[PDB]
Structure 1
Amino acid sequence: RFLKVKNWETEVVLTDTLHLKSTLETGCTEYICMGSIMHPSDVATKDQLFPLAKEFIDQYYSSIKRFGSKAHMERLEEVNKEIDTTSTYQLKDTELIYGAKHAWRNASRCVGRIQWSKLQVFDARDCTTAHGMFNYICNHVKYATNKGNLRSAITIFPQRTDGKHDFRVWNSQLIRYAGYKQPDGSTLGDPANVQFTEICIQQGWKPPRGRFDVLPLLLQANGNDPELFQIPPELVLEVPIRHPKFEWFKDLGLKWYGLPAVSNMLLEIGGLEFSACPFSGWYMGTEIGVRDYCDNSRYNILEEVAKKMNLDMRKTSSLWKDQALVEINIAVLYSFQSDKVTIVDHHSATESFIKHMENEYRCRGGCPADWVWIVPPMSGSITPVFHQEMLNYRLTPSFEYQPDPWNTHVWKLV
């Protein structure tokens, strides 16, 4: 069986066979589509783990043209022994690297996957304490940031065991700014991070109470209570936002960090769950310029920018929001490029994603892609992905959502 996808701009038609390998649920049913649901839908038993492990080891050995080899069969034998005797197993380093890369390759929501195979994998499975996690994360940040020449990287902490000894980065990203609810209902800093900022403060963090306070790391090792650590400031590369034409833009006092590093997802490889697996790449500008800066729930700067632009804001059909949004995103890109910090604009990124998609169809038989996420949050139809039909399905290894740690963690101190 085959499924065809068409680009309505180029009329290129691609043929997806890879969807036949999909495993887990999309959330849709035959009569309901949940493609715009953000999160649709304790630890694996021995019986559940065997086939998951087998399928992963089979696909690892197929990828390296060793399917059915003696090494393939001995690895299956060996994996089965550990599951039988220990109720889990340990990945070889090669398998960990392959697994991490393919979870990225399989991330249907990620427009940046043309880069999937160039992923630096830091094996942190020997880590035992939050201090060790901090050290591993600093090394990750420093390597990934690379003085602005950003390099993709992931750091993989020990896998889940009984679900009671989870490693977790409590931060949603490694680098984010604090948010502080004011008594008057206004928010200082990033409103998205108010709750997490409260948790940090409650754990002892002394907040500067500024607009762009880099949050401390809140790191949980082995199911213990999480611990606070300040990322050394010299490792946090930031970009002050200015505009190439509007001299007043710098007066807005905006900055952002260079390193987008997601740390609250779960990496699943062969049925193993890596609950702490921070990964980082580089920014597409609309992430900052459209969502971080202009979401009504985020820094919400449209009004201020439009004011300084002298736009007519009395009516929506003046498209004053649209006009200000473009300029903000111009500023974001100009600023990063001026500081020689890796960034990709949505046009280049979606263009590369189409090339990647077509290549994946050619060499892999498909490429799961979540149109709702792949299309940029501005100027959608002038990017090529808008016109690209996509099939969404869940391949493993995969990155998955997991509950926030403060909702499941049971505290131990006092």
Structure 2
Amino acid sequence: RFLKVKNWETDVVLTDTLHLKSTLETGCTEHICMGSIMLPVRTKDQLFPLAKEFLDQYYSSIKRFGSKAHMDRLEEVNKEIESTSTYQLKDTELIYGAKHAWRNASRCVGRIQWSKLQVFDARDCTTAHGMFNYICNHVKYATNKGNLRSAITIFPQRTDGKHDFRVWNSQLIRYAGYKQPDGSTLGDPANVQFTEICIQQGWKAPRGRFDVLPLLLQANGNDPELFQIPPELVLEVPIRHPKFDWFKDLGLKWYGLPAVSNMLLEIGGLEFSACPFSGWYMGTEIGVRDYCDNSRYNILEEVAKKMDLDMRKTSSLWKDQALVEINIAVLYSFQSDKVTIVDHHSATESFIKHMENEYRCRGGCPADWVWIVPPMSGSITPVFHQEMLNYRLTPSFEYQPDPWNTHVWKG
């Protein structure tokens, strides 16, 4: 069953066959689309089949499908699973796995870079201090003095679900958020809950508007431990505008390395609950969402004032005018300081090329339009005009519940 997607701006039509290999569910039915919904211990029984599908894809990728090496690997894993109820991936398989989870991430517009992922194998890690060390190395390698490199660090996989490794932070680097008694929020509102947990764990909060949070790391199902990332390892960019000299006076800045650290990486049935990964920012992430979401730093009003914009009536599009400026400032500041960053026009054009390539060389490219289209200037980016098919392939990156909601504290 073939399926075609059309780009209404170029009339280019593509045919998708890859969706046929999709096994997981979407959340949608023939009766309802849940396309805009944010979030719509395994058994030996269910493990080997997942393992075989993976190994089959892996061996095909290296052109050794059906070889003796392939067959022996299946036999070996089968035995190991029956013998230990789980199995260990070879280094080669882990790298292939991690790269494909990124390749299969439908919400990611930066996937044209998927094959260049640097994979750090932290499966020999046993303690939080060990985790802290791997994480520091990942940040230094990835930051590369501003010339960012994509990377992922993979800690030991889940076993019985009672010895999980977890990074409690949502990103390796992020700013604290503090709820004030007058109801206002100091810092980043998105991290208030986590910030409270850190303080409760012993962190001495400096209580400023841009305090880098400490790492709260959990190894082998133990209680999480706090660690401060060496400041010299955290690259930050002061935000200023190329034409407005007062912009710098807003005292804004952001970190250069975006590193999601709360997702779960699934490979051949195995679950890697601590798999922090990083790339580089697309401007709008900071400029539109982190700075202008009403629930984030919410700086639109203050910026519009300084610009002396008609804020009497929305139809003056004062919000839209200020948004552009703020986004111009983010891109400008990063570029001046030579910290890697990509604007939405450039990133989306690249994704379209990546997508076309994938259809031609792979038979498709699962993509989530709701997420792919930038939060500003939607239709002036090619992705808006591009029809997309969203479906779940493994290996994959999945959401998981915040650990403070599931953790059995030991004291």
CA distance in 1: counterparts of 2:24 and 2:130, whole angstroms = 34
Paired residues for 1:6-155 under 5 Å: 6-40=6-40, 43-155=41-153
Q: What displacement does 1:314 show?
A: 1.1
CA distance in 2: counterparts of 1:192 and 1:314, whole angstroms = 29
CA distance in 1: counterparts of 2:42 and 2:102, whole angstroms = 23
CA distance in 2: counterparts of 1:187 and 1:355, whole angstroms = 42
Q: What displacement does 1:364 show?
A: 0.2
Describe the superposition over 1:36-58 as per-residue Cα deviations: whole angstroms up to 9, x where unpaired.
00000xx1100000100000000
CA distance in 2: counterparts of 1:355 and 1:407, whole angstroms = 41
Which residue of structure 2 lines up, in the alignment, with residue 363 of structure 1? Answer: 361
CA RMSD of aligned residues (A): 0.3
Describe the superposition over 1:310-336 as per-residue Cα deviations: whole angstroms up to 9, x where unpaired.
001111111100000000000000000
CA distance in 1: counterparts of 2:273 and 2:160, whole angstroms = 12
CA distance in 2: counterparts of 1:314 and 1:81, whole angstroms = 72
Q: What displacement does 1:355 show?
A: 0.2
Q: What displacement does 1:230 show?
A: 0.1
Q: What displacement does 1:308 show?
A: 0.3
Paired residues for 1:2-401 under 5 Å: 2-40=2-40, 43-401=41-399
Unaligned runs of 5+ in 1: none
Q: What displacement does 1:77 show?
A: 0.4
Total equivalences in the alignment: 410
Partner-residue secondary structure (3-state), 1:261? coil
CA distance in 1: counterparts of 2:143 and 2:193, whole angstroms = 27
CA distance in 1: counterparts of 2:343 and 2:111, whole angstroms = 15
CA distance in 1: counterparts of 2:11 and 2:244, whole angstroms = 41
Partner-residue secondary structure (3-state), 1:389? coil
Q: What displacement does 1:102 show?
A: 0.2
Describe the superposition over 1:279-319 as per-residue Cα deviations: whole angstroms up to 9, x where unpaired.
00000000000000000000000000000000011111111
Q: TM-score, normalised by structure 2?
A: 1.00
Q: What displacement does 1:30 show?
A: 1.1
Q: TM-score, normalised by structure 1?
A: 0.99
Partner-residue secondary structure (3-state), 1:122? strand
CA distance in 2: counterparts of 1:166 and 1:221, whole angstroms = 7
CA distance in 2: counterparts of 1:132 and 1:345, whole angstroms = 36
CA distance in 2: counterparts of 1:50 and 1:334, whole angstroms = 51
Structure 1 runs (4+) greater than 4 angstroms displaced: none
Describe the superposition over 1:203-233 as per-residue Cα deviations: whole angstroms up to 9, x where unpaired.
0000000000000000000000000000000
Describe the superposition over 1:140-194 as per-residue Cα deviations: whole angstroms up to 9, x where unpaired.
0000000000000000000000000000000000000000111101111000000
Partner-residue secondary structure (3-state), 2:78? helix
Q: What displacement does 1:110 show?
A: 0.1
State the identity %: 97
Partner-residue secondary structure (3-state), 1:116? helix
CA distance in 1: counterparts of 2:179 and 2:33, whole angstroms = 37
CA distance in 1: counterparts of 2:17 and 2:337, whole angstroms = 43
Partner-residue secondary structure (3-state), 1:273? strand
Partner-residue secondary structure (3-state), 1:304? helix
Partner-residue secondary structure (3-state), 2:366? coil
Partner-residue secondary structure (3-state), 2:237? strand
Describe the superposition over 1:210-262 as per-residue Cα deviations: whole angstroms up to 9, x where unpaired.
00000000000000000000000000000000000100000000000000000
Describe the superposition over 1:74-108 as per-residue Cα deviations: whole angstroms up to 9, x where unpaired.
00001101110100000000000000000000000
Describe the superposition over 1:90-136 as per-residue Cα deviations: whole angstroms up to 9, x where unpaired.
00000000000000000000000000000000000000000000000
CA distance in 1: counterparts of 2:395 and 2:13, whole angstroms = 27
Partner-residue secondary structure (3-state), 1:117? helix
Partner-residue secondary structure (3-state), 2:265? strand
Partner-residue secondary structure (3-state), 2:163? coil
Describe the superposition over 1:348-384 as per-residue Cα deviations: whole angstroms up to 9, x where unpaired.
0000000000000010000000000000000000000
Partner-residue secondary structure (3-state), 2:397? strand
CA distance in 1: counterparts of 2:21 and 2:227, whole angstroms = 42
Unaligned runs of 5+ in 2: none
Partner-residue secondary structure (3-state), 1:399? strand
CA distance in 2: counterparts of 1:81 and 1:402, whole angstroms = 30
CA distance in 2: counterparts of 1:287 and 1:19, whole angstroms = 29
Partner-residue secondary structure (3-state), 1:47? helix
Q: What displacement does 1:199 show?
A: 0.2
Partner-residue secondary structure (3-state), 2:116? coil
CA distance in 2: counterparts of 1:284 and 1:256, whole angstroms = 13
CA distance in 2: counterparts of 1:82 and 1:263, whole angstroms = 30
Partner-residue secondary structure (3-state), 1:256? strand
